[PDB]
Amino acid sequence: TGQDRVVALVDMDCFFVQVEQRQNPHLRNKPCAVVQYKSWKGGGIIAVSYEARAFGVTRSMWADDAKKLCPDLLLAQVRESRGKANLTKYREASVEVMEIMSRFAVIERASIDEAYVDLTSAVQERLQKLQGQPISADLLPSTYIEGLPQGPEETVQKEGMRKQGLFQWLDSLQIDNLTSPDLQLTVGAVIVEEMRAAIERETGFQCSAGISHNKVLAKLACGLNKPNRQTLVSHGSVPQLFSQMPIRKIRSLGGKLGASVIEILGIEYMGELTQFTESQLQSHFGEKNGSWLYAMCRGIEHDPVKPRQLPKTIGCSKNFPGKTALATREQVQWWLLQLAQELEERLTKDRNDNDRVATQLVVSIRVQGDKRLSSLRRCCALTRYDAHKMSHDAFTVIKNCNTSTEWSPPLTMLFLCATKFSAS
DNA sequence: ATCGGCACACT
DNA sequence: AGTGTGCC
Numbered sequence: 001t002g003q004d005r006v007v008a009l010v011d012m013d014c015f016f017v018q019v020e021q022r023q024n025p026h027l028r029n030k031p032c033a034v035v036q037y038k039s040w041k042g043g044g045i046i047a048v049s050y051e052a053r054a055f056g057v058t059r060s061m062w063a064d065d066a067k068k069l070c071p072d073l074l075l076a077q078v079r080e081s082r083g084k085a086n087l088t089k090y091r092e093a094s095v096e097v098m099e100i101m102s103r104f105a106v107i108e109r110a111s112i113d114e115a116y117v118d119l120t121s122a123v124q125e126r127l128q129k130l131q132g133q134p135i136s137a138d139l140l141p142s143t144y145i146e147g148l149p150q151g152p153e154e155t156v157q158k159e160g161m162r163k164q165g166l167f168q169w170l171d172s173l174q175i176d177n178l179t180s181p182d183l184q185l186t187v188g189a190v191i192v193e194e195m196r197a198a199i200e201r202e203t204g205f206q207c208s209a210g211i212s213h214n215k216v217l218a219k220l221a222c223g224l225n226k227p228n229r230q231t232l233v234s235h236g237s238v239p240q241l242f243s244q245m246p247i248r249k250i251r252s253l254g255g256k257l258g259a260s261v262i263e264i265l266g267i268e269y270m271g272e273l274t275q276f277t278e279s280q281l282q283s284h285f286g287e288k289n290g291s292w293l294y295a296m297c298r299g300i301e302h303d304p305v306k307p308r309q310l311p312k313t314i315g316c317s318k319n320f321p322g323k324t325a326l327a328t329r330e331q332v333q334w335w336l337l338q339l340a341q342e343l344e345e346r347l348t349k350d351r352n353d354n355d356r357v358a359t360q361l362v363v364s365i366r367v368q369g370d371k372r373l374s375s376l377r378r379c380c381a382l383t384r385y386d387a388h389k390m391s392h393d394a395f396t397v398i399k400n401c402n403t404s405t406e407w408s409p410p411l412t413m414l415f416l417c418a419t420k421f422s423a424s
Numbered sequence: 425a426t427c428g429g430c431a432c433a434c435t
Numbered sequence: 436a437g438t439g440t441g442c443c
């Protein structure tokens with residue numbers, strides 16, 4: 001079936017922008033982006049409001065270039081600490097949202113601004129409490145039903161379409177059977193409406209949600225009606241939805257694997273995957289992937305929503321690209337120390353707030369003219385949350401790397417990460 | 425010089 | 436353990 005569970009995916013809209021907009025009222029309802037490291041081309045853009053997007057502004061764009069596209073664009077700068085970007089403000093805002101969501105159901109923190117929710121149980125409970133009662137259209141004020149309306153002047157308006165689709169969906173719904181997968185999705189959507197309302201009221205942040213039977217579909221659904229809307233993707237909408245759906249849009253298919261599927265199989269849409277047998281797919285892409293693709297193109301995925309609200313690892317890194325690369329011993333030690341200081345500050349907060357300690361410290365370095373993203377990876381024991389010792393240990397482990405009071409080759413990157421957390 | 429940052433599969 | 440991928 002693949003209609004066994006109810007899963008939702010919630011994602012904040014232009015999250016960093018919202019954080020800056022809440023803190024500054026002036027940036028509200030204006031085109032704006034968030035940038036870091038202004039010196040170079042005005043800084044790199046990592047977050048763009050929807051007002052700015054209408055002008056074509058995107059992340060990974062230089063602020064100066066963005067200005068050319070959008071003359072009145074307002075910019076917000078990431079806090080800078082110890083010579084590197086500090087994402088503390090956004091991490092704290094993130095916790096706020098996660099905490100509200102946690103109240104409604106067990107969630108999986110997928111990223112800083114999105115979380116997966118398994119509502120299977122909550123939906124069942126709700127059904128019992130409102131048992132025998134129809135679902136009013138009023139309960140789903142921002143819900144879109146994928147694939148509707150269908151068949152037969154309101155439609156010209158976006159809102160008109162949404163209302164008509166929802167009416168058709170609700171009208172079709174049979175209150176009589178609790179078991180119906182579609183009914184459970186509708187109830188789950190009501191819960192997500194309530195959850196989204198709570199988030200907006202308590203944090204002031206707007207967000208979008210996708211409600212479906214699995215995480216991949218939920219994610220896909222979420223992206224359909226951004227921003228400030230939630231989309232319900234039923235099992236039945238999948239054939240029509242997937243039929244013109246590019247392969248790269250499915251989660252985890254945006255990279256090389258997706259490209260292999262397209263290149264090898266000679267298809268461009270998700271639906272086209274249905275013709276191939278499971279065995280064929282497994283032979284081309286492996287047993288695990290083959291199984292996943294065969295099931296996925298039919299709208300079925302079984303990956304569980306992990307009950308995890310905390311990051312497994314905590315790391316900080318800095319790039320020194322091109323000329324800026326560190327060529328001296330003293331430089332490497334100084335930067336290692338800076339990294340260690342931020343790490344210690346985050347670690348202490350983690351120990352006090354989450355009551356756990358990290359057992360392993362990981363050091364990563366890159367050198368000039370290296371094809372590999374990570375030039376080297378090393379780990380050492382992390383006995384105490386002390387910056388001086390941590391930097392010294394990292395240096396001790398990577399001291400052997402230098403080929404030549406000078407360092408050679410110069411280092412493109414420094415990376416420290418704390419891992420292997422244990423209860424304390 | 426599109427940065428810093430997470431999780432996972434594979435060996 | 437260390438490497439490589441994919442995403443936010």
Ligand SMILES: Nc1nc2c(ncn2[C@H]2C[C@H](O)[C@@H](COP(=O)(O)NP(=O)(O)OP(=O)(O)O)O2)c(=O)[nH]1
Pocket residue numbers: 011012013014015016017046047048059112113226227427428443
């Ligand atoms: N440094 C950095 N931060 C990033 C990057 N990509 C995203 N972020 C940070 C900054 C982002 O604000 C935040 C959330 O990631 P999204 O959900 O993928 N995009 P948003 O919520 O902005 O918009 P919407 O969801 O409505 O399209 O993660 C990046 O490539 N680099």
Ligand SMILES: [Mg+2]
Pocket residue numbers: 011012013014015113
């Ligand atoms: Mg977002």
Ligand SMILES: [Mg+2]
Pocket residue numbers: 011012111113114443
């Ligand atoms: Mg996101």
